[PDB]
Amino acid sequence: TVRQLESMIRLSEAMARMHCCDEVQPKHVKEAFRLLNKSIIRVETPDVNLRLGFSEYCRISNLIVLHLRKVEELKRSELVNWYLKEIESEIDSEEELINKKRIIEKVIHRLTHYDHVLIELTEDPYLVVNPNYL
């Protein structure tokens, strides 16, 4: 009900106060939307095959799908280069960079050949989004 809307506003304001920001930004809204949605929650998500967490897997999938869908209105190497450009704010060492390259290569391959969300079109194959992913 409207009470949940007021709670959402309160949560956004709390996020804004946490970051010492005089104005509220949509990032806080996106953050609070998950917390309001989750409800039933496990202790810990299991690992996914070097292992990676389910939340990070979903985050990478969402980012790559959003970028490809935005560009729709690409190439494998170009997309990897974009991702590494976007994540430069977190990597601080060469080892972390090579780890990130390994992870993104593995994730793109896994999406291409297991989850079928990414479709290959014919060393630099074209990648397209399966038209039934929202």
């Binding site: 079928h116 479709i119 290959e120 079109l121 014919t122 074209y126 397209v128 399966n130 038209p131 039934n132």
Partner: protein, 364 residues
């Protein structure tokens, strides 16, 4: 020709050996629907040029038909009519003595064998041990979709050699689909077509026949943009919505006035427990009479019990919308069941301007 089928062919050829050699009395081959059991064995038999009789169990729904067809085809390979299995054995022994049938193995291919267990009790055991009884260098093959575990009789019989046809994969399916490319365009064009089609539909439809049928249907729309004037992006953008519309249907390929009220009343009677009926219809606080009372309550106008409403009831029963439960002779206490989907009843209520959800006890 056969593609991605080389292990099984080699195994069968090794099993056969030479013409004068003997083989197993019974081989039971099982696999999936699109494994190609009929294609591979028939092509192999044609290539090796062996005396073989091909039989469909479904066509021979009676024992006499089966035996007569087998005997007639075998004679044509070299009129005869038989009635009992022993007579069939004797006539088979008589007919197998031909010079062309002297030192050669005789093969009886049976397909769709799943019905054999429903024909006769002793027919399957007799067919299993045919080589012992005839003693005339005879081999019998089985093709089926059910595992051998369910074909075992209670008394137990001569165990056939069991064989499995491997399931298909992405590469095998792509190769098979790309073999029969149309001559009017490049092979790589059809390969890309097969690639995108598999990337779209492999999740659900793995049937080779079905996927090939879909490709045949959808190719003309695939080839339009280039005719209109190797542009992968252009073709994909032009073609995606049509593929989505096609995927909407993978395996699929106005009542009278009072009839609508009868149908909705029947649905209410079926899916609403009797205890709550008055709670929904009595102004103050399944058998035919309950249906009549509910109909009288729902309709705002006074409806006379003309025979035409009973004719409507019987017509609805005939149209397989309402199922009769009780005995047909008992036409004073009849029982009915409603078999209409909920979406259909909601649509008809919308066309009637009636809100059925307000009366459904389960939803409340």
């Amino acid at each position: 020709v056969v593609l991605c089928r080389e292990s099984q062919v080699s195994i069968l050829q090794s099993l056969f050996g030479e013409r004068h050699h003997f083989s197993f009395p019974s081989i039971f081959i099982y696999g999936h629907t699109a494994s190609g059991k009929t294609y591979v064995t028939q092509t192999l038999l044609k290539t090796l040029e062996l005396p073989h009789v091909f039989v469909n169990c479904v066509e021979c729904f009676t024992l006499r038909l089966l035996l007569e067809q087998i005997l007639n085809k075998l004679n044509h390979l070299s009129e005869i009519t038989c009635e009992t299995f022993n007579d069939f054995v004797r006539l088979f022994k008589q007919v197998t003595t031909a010079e062309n049938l002297k030192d050669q193995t005789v093969y009886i291919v049976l397909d769709k064998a799943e019905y054999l267990r429903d024909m006769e009790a002793n027919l399957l055991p007799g067919f299993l041990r045919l080589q012992e009884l005839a003693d005339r260098n005879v081999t019998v093959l089985f093709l089926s979709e059910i595992v051998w575990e369910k074909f075992r009789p209670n008394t137990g019989c001569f165990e056939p050699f069991v064989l499995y046809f491997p399931d298909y994969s992405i590469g095998n399916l792509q190769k098979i689909l790309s073999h029969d490319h149309p001559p009017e365009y490049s092979a790589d064009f059809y390969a890309a077509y097969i690639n995108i089609l598999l990337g779209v539909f492999y999740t659900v439809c793995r049937d080779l026949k079905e996927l090939r049928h879909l490709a045949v249907l959808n190719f003309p729309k695939y080839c339009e943009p280039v005719v209109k004037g190797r542009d992968t992006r252009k073709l994909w953008r032009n073609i995606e919505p049509h593929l989505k519309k096609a995927m909407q249907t993978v395996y699929l390929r106005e009542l009278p006035y009072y009839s609508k009220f009868i149908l909705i009343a029947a649905y209410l009677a079926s899916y609403n427990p009797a205890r709550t009926d008055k709670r929904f219809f009595l102004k103050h606080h399944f058998p035919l009479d309950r249906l009549l009372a509910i109909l009288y309550s729902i309709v705002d106008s006074r409806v006379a019990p003309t025979a035409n409403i009973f004719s409507q009831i019987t017509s609805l029963v005939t149209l397989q919308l309402l199922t009769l439960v009780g005995h047909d002779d008992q036409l004073d206490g009849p029982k009915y069941k409603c078999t209409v989907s909920l979406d259909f009843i909601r649509a008809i209520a919308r066309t009637v301007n009636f809100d059925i959800i307000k009366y459904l006890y389960d939803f409340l």
